[PDB]
Symmetry: C3
Subunit: 274 residues, 3 copies
């Protein structure tokens, strides 16, 4: 079934850019690639090129120009396409709100947990039968990659919070005050966004080593002015150079393979399929 145009393209690391991150810059020797999927179009062309001898595939989850809101993303096509290229590692870069004073706008967070409060994403899996698949996601992120992101941040002198629970909401509207109080005071979540689920579910089912590098862009409803879309975008674009510096530091060190014992999803299917 699988066809790419141009043919024969492969990559080792995938980067899924979120808010503010619509192009890479600069993969060398870039090529725009069309990757067939059983689910139709990924968000945009995938750009494949080289970073210090490592082949990287970049996909803007919202499309170039931020054309696709969180609820309308073809998550299945995006992850299928990256898997079809041969990627082993996936770095997601995302904008998040903070539910705690000490996670400040401009700080990075490398989450370790999530809570799914989405509702309208239509498909939360690749496996609709006849092989029933129930992956374990107790520890949903790839720890090998998490630790490499934290190390890079520290080496560059950036603040990187080493843990966090991400509450994923449906959107596109932001939370009410009453909702935000539930997330913060009842669920004791740390950060909030709209795009993690079902991206992470699908990455795990695909046996990828996936981790999120989140940038705090706002304090949700808790600052004297509530979050707006314009604020999020401005803070992300202001800080995108720091995100790029982290990526160009991390990627050369991903030439090898994830360590199985620090990659919860890397053999996910072995015990998950009935």
């Amino acid at each position: 079934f699988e066809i790419t145009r141009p043919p024969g393209v492969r990559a080792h690391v995938g980067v899924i850019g979120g808010s503010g991150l619509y192009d890479p810059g600069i993969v060398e020797n870039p090529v725009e690639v069309k990757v067939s999927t059983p689910y139709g179009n990924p968000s945009d062309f995938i750009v494949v090129g080289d970073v210090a001898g490592v082949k990287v595939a970049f996909l803007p989850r919202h499309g170039r120009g931020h054309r696709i809101p969180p609820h309308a993303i073809n998550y299945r096509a995006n992850i299928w396409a990256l898997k079809a290229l041969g990627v082993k590692w996936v770095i997601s870069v995302s904008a998040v709100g903070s539910l705690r004073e000490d996670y400040r706008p401009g700080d990075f967070v490398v989450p370790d947990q999530f809570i799914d409060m989405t509702k309208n994403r239509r498909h939360y899996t690749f496996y609709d039968g006849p092989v029933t698949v129930h992956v374990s996601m107790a520890d949903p992120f790839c720890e090998d990659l998490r630790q490499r992101l934290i190390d890079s941040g520290r080496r560059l002198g950036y603040t990187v919070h080493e843990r966090g629970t991400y509450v994923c909401i449906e959107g596109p509207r932001f939370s009410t005050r009453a909702e935000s109080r539930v997330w913060k005071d009842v669920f004791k979540a740390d950060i909030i966004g709209m795009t993690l689920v079902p991206e992470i579910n699908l990455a795990c089912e695909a046996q990828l080593c996936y981790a999120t590098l989140a940038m705090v862009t706002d304090y949700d409803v808790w600052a004297d002015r509530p979050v707006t879309a314009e604020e999020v975008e401005r803070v992300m674009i202001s800080n995108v150079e720091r995100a790029r510096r982290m990526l160009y530091d991390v990627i050369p060190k991903l030439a090898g393979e994830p360590e199985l014992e620090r990659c919860s999803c890397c053999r996910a299917l072995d015990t998950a399929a009935i």
Copy 2:
């Protein structure tokens, strides 16, 4: 694209009637209007007429005869149609359950917050791309209208609770005891219903001044007999005259425009669109 039959019809105030409220009574000079929408049919004909020189559009959200349950309402068509008529203010009248002893059957509530626990409403926005829109809904109701409803209630001698958090559930079944304990004791919500979301989301995106006048019809699972549909309908029909008296008091005072500084959604799109 926009066509009405008859042509040329406009209105200033919209009223969305809930349980028990299927006709107005009596807009003068009433006309039934068909309003084209990109989403198909609204719940029913919209009835447009005059109340003390203010043009009012009435829409029964469940259709005449209560034909459309909460999960099957074409929320996008309903709000598009009201916007297309030129309305600035939208009064929703709704039946709710109470999660607290002091919010008693027969009392009105003018909520200020909500928590969305729906799942199956299919579209929670008008904006699916390519313009991505994330409206702020920290304070989701229009405060100008809330205060006018409270003032009218007080002037008429009715009990009107001046705040409340509405938990919106999916339905159509009512809550289990275990669910109701979560709403009451964990989320600390005050009232419960099925129709607020995504109606309110869409109204905000449409830059309307929307507020809910809720009538408590029951105590959910917490009275010696649990809520039934027959009970809700009976209590609403018993009290509909009081709701009508409030409307005929409020509407003449809506001849002007919402105050921007007391209308959180009136310029929602200015900072929400990417």
Copy 3:
């Protein structure tokens, strides 16, 4: 509309088998039956036969061979088909995780409450209009049947926990640690599974006496190794003989009708329809 092949088949008790329970064994005089529904195919053929003079209909909710995951089950077709055969009682057998130390793998639980945390089941009711139906589900299980299951377990010498709140999650992935902490410590649920909703909703709307016999197969994320699909299936298959012994004990005593005063859904429609 209603056609069966072969024609004329009727049954009194339905059994909906979950994980590990794909065939009965041994209804005498078994026949595989096709039952037309307005919703298309049930999960598999329904097998009808006799158990000590009581006519029983068995339906594997996942299909033979566990071909259909929880989110892909045609719940409406399954319950319509059982109702069309004339069943009055429905015993569901299900695998669940435990959120409490004392509900141990191998123990049975007869839940009394549930919390619905699903999102993607598409239809949560039979009633989409023009008759609006809102069933009361404060006490969602049929108490007559619950008590008969508990009595059978005790008579056979098995551990059967006499109450429990079932949290139904969407899946197919298992919960994260952060999610499981919400279920356990915030919602104070006892057991967790994926298939109860909307099966139970539909059974109640169909005026069936429905109860769940759950078998604890795992402790979710809380044991030194998190739950896997292979573990659940193995524990269920190891214990399926005990589930069969309970069924063959209970079924002969269901020759009569549910007691109305101990069957919350048996006249559900009387007060639910508008």
